[PDB]
């Protein structure tokens with residue numbers, strides 16, 4: 651049974667694991683600590699991108715608008731922004747790509763600025779019927795992952811449901827939805843996490859994150875060979891494991907959850 655299997659992973663690895671597998675319409679299929687709070691860390695970038703795209707859908711933003719910045723805007727982890735800084739800008743489109751596929755923190759901060767900041771991301775979550783997820787800080791302080799702290803948190807179920815809405819629901823235009831899906835499929839940081847626990851024949855897109863205090867997270871959508879559509883969130887705090895082992899833990903959790911998909 652699922653509860654036993656995750657419980658053992660937790661004991662053997664000295665780790666805290668939260669999981670939610672939801673259907674295309676957002677119903678919970680299987681979960682473990684599904685309603686408990688975990689820090690989003692980079693996983694917030696997925697709904698951040700969707701907010702930007704929905705502003706584009708509304709004619710409130712242009713995908714080729716230039717977002718200007720200088721060296722003082724850079725962060726420790728900003729590999730695309732470090733590349734473009736001499737030109738003085740990244741387009742909205744380049745920023746969306748970079749934030750999602752490379753987890754670039756300067757790109758993410760540019761997009762937070764464009765959308766009106768953490769409160770307006772929080773308002774977006776509420777507009778989607780997510781009454782739990784919230785953003786309070788920007789990069790890189792949003793990743794502190796202090797025990798008990800509610801700032802910059804979600805729950806496995808709330809994020810899974812939110813992502814199911816963005817990817818499979820009709821909040822976004824067909825155009826924007828397709829762009830978001832394809833960017834996530836092409837994520838460069840998720841090859842050893844949830845996707846590693848799923849059959850290679852399934853279509854998979856995802857957004858990963860790492861936090862202080864050993865946080866390591868992934869949320870993925872997938873489409874099986876039978877065309878059935880799911881979202882899986884996996885949020886972990888495993889301070890006693892090494893880096894690659896945190897990834898293997900997530901992939902092991904995905905391989906367990908996968909058994910609750912029909913086919």
Ligand SMILES: *C(=O)[C@](NC(=O)[C@H](C(=O)O)c1ccc(O)cc1)(OC)[C@@H]1N=C(C(=O)O)C(=C)CO1
Pocket residue numbers: 691692693726727752753754755789790793839840857858859860861862
């Ligand atoms: C998002 O999770 C990620 N990390 C951070 O924003 C944060 C920081 O830049 O201080 C951080 C970095 C390294 C850590 O070990 C812990 C926290 O965004 C840059 C980044 N995202 C990843 C991802 O797969 O998406 C990473 C592997 C590294 O964390």
Ligand code: NA
Pocket residue numbers: 845846847848849850
């Ligand atoms: Na795979």
